[PDB]
Write an enzyme that holds these catalytic residues in place. Structure first.
Site, PDB file in Angstrom:
ATOM      1  N   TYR A 197      50.307 -39.845 -70.773  1.00 25.74           N
ATOM      2  CA  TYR A 197      49.033 -40.244 -71.216  1.00 25.74           C
ATOM      3  C   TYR A 197      48.821 -41.403 -70.136  1.00 25.74           C
ATOM      4  O   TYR A 197      49.865 -41.896 -69.791  1.00 25.74           O
ATOM      5  CB  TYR A 197      49.376 -40.878 -72.618  1.00 25.74           C
ATOM      6  CG  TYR A 197      49.681 -39.769 -73.610  1.00 25.74           C
ATOM      7  CD1 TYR A 197      51.072 -39.131 -73.444  1.00 25.74           C
ATOM      8  CD2 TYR A 197      48.799 -39.320 -74.620  1.00 25.74           C
ATOM      9  CE1 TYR A 197      51.477 -37.968 -74.262  1.00 25.74           C
ATOM     10  CE2 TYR A 197      49.126 -38.677 -75.495  1.00 25.74           C
ATOM     11  CZ  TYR A 197      50.625 -37.813 -75.657  1.00 25.74           C
ATOM     12  OH  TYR A 197      50.665 -36.944 -76.393  1.00 25.74           O
ATOM     13  N   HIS A 248      44.505 -38.394 -75.519  1.00 25.16           N
ATOM     14  CA  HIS A 248      45.252 -37.119 -75.188  1.00 25.16           C
ATOM     15  C   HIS A 248      45.789 -37.423 -73.911  1.00 25.16           C
ATOM     16  O   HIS A 248      45.806 -38.147 -73.323  1.00 25.16           O
ATOM     17  CB  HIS A 248      44.082 -35.835 -75.118  1.00 25.16           C
ATOM     18  CG  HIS A 248      44.021 -35.247 -76.498  1.00 25.16           C
ATOM     19  ND1 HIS A 248      42.800 -35.469 -77.412  1.00 25.16           N
ATOM     20  CD2 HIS A 248      44.649 -33.911 -77.009  1.00 25.16           C
ATOM     21  CE1 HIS A 248      42.867 -34.817 -78.173  1.00 25.16           C
ATOM     22  NE2 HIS A 248      43.779 -33.730 -78.157  1.00 25.16           N
ATOM     23  N   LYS A 252      42.887 -31.216 -67.246  1.00 28.64           N
ATOM     24  CA  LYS A 252      43.847 -32.288 -67.189  1.00 28.64           C
ATOM     25  C   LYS A 252      44.186 -32.350 -65.731  1.00 28.64           C
ATOM     26  O   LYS A 252      43.930 -31.336 -64.907  1.00 28.64           O
ATOM     27  CB  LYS A 252      45.242 -31.824 -67.982  1.00 28.64           C
ATOM     28  CG  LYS A 252      45.324 -32.430 -69.408  1.00 28.64           C
ATOM     29  CD  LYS A 252      46.367 -31.892 -69.835  1.00 28.64           C
ATOM     30  CE  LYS A 252      46.622 -31.918 -71.258  1.00 28.64           C
ATOM     31  NZ  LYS A 252      45.349 -32.777 -71.940  1.00 28.64           N
TER      32      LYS A 252
END
Ligand SMILES: [Au+]
Ligand SMILES: [Au+]
Ligand SMILES: [Au+]
Ligand SMILES: [Au+]
EC number: 4.6.1.16
Lengths: 171, 171, 171, 171
Positions: A107, A117, A148
């Site tokens: 994170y 998230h 991501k």
């Protein structure tokens, strides 16, 4: 010094406050009236001087003892350990990346784990070992598929960690 | 249809006009008495339908003929030809990146390759192949020192290309 | 005779004594709870007679044993070991040159690597193998930008090493 | 414009003054009463505007014509010519390296005779062709052996020439 119990590939904590302290900093997963730490986590907690781990007798294991036991249970233990310790030290909340095939998932620093998230998918690699380039391009695709960023953590021959970010580009 | 003379690792063009046409779009090197192209440039221009290449007699060599010859004399011709063609198609001016240990160096659509500098440094890699991280780790460094953007062109078994960037990072 | 634990790509040393000994002569990395050596380093130390290495058993691996293991997990282990042992023997403090795309980076025997910069960048090659010039060409460049001396270590079939330098030249 | 006669792999200049001018700049070798020029030399001299070659009675040959001929006679013509012209343009007395296994042998800038020795040995290499590293180390051995400096002349993919010096080093 919080107490934990060596249970195979995990270390359990039951002390009410012990679990509250560790859950605050976000270590392991809370399963009912217990908190489960991974072996790398327990080793780092021991290294921090926060956790104490007993297995058989009432004599808690030493870092070396827990290492000797874990190396024969976990895979790439030293690889995952050196990097995990580094990221934790860099102020990150490190959690397994298993779900994505990655070693870790992190994170943002200062991120409110409550509403936020994970942002980075981390995959560790030893400098002196060659592998298929598709291994990397594959992680770039997974990372990307889940919005991501991929983070390549290399443990160089000197035992130091070097990080690289890899992404898609359209010249 | 400009005709060239295959001579070892390059193709010679004597036609004063072909020399102007090609030089205009930045293909090849004008020696003065002639213009010479690289095997990859020649393969590309044949593919465009601009060039005709003769070797020992007159009968021009087919693309596949010239292509087989070049594959035989140049280790990574497949890779380089593929990425060059692709970047040339994107409008970039593709030149050699040898001085930097790279495959190519690029210039924007319209640029005076003379007083201007290349903006990209490119390195080509077959995707389904084993590699060592230092190969990329060194590239990012050099690109950095010479203050240039980098492209890591990876060509899959199907001959398709995906460009990637890579950057050093301190989490 | 310090004893370490073979754990994948590195060797773990817990003995606080060996940690001091090795650390003094600049060997391995002191994580804090242990010191870890690279496979090349461990091989060298076994050879030096200073170290003992044990894997999945209390029976130390012979030099030839660990060596074969390493040969298997690391592509160029042979080359790097040979050149590492040689430069170490010459008195240099041999570290990794990953950040520059090189094999090693060297410090003078009396260098304070904490305050000082490496004075050499080293790249290794097997003499009787085909290579592409961009492989040296880029190395020469990085070595230049980072303002460092370079060494091209060329190991012949017998494992003997000859060092060469290379400089860009404008005649 | 001096006249020369195409004689196989040599162009002979008989003119008394012609020989004088060329011999002054050091072109060709002087045997008997004439002057023998090499095909690359003759091509350069034609390029210079100094020479006019013709096969006997036939009309003088054009640069393209002689090249057409020479290429099916001499080896690596384009290679050797591109470098030779360059070194000649840089003000060097370029002569054969044949006696040493090199392509050319160079004499310091421009005021050397026969009592003065050649300073460099030059070996041209096309960038995209791979070869055994032992080939390079071989030239370092010859150069060193004859107390000369080895100059690596690379004809890159762009047609330009990049020079590198390679020598032994005792770390
Ligand atoms: Au490790
Ligand atoms: Au191809
Ligand atoms: Au070896
Ligand atoms: Au050529």
């Amino acid at each position: 010094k919080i107490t934990g119990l060596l249970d195979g590939d995990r270390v359990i904590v039951f002390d009410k406050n012990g679990i509250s302290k560790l859950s605050a900093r976000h270590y392991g997963n809370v399963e009912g009236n217990f908190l489960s730490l991974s072996l790398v986590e327990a080793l780092y907690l021991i290294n921090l001087g926060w956790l104490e781990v007993k297995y058989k007798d009432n004599k808690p294991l030493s870092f070396e003892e827990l290492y000797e036991y874990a190396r024969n249970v976990e895979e790439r233990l030293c690889l995952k350990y050196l990097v995990y310790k580094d990221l934790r030290t860099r102020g990150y909340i490190v959690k397994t990346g298993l779900k994505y095939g990655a070693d870790f998932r992190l994170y943002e620093r200062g991120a409110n784990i409550d509403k936020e998230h994970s942002v980075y998918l981390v995959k560790v690699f030893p400098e002196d070992s060659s592998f298929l380039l598709s291994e990397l391009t594959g992680f770039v695709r997974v990372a990307h598929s889940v919005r991501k960023k991929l983070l390549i953590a290399i443990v160089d021959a000197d035992g130091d960690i070097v990080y690289y970010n890899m992404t898609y580009v359209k010249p």
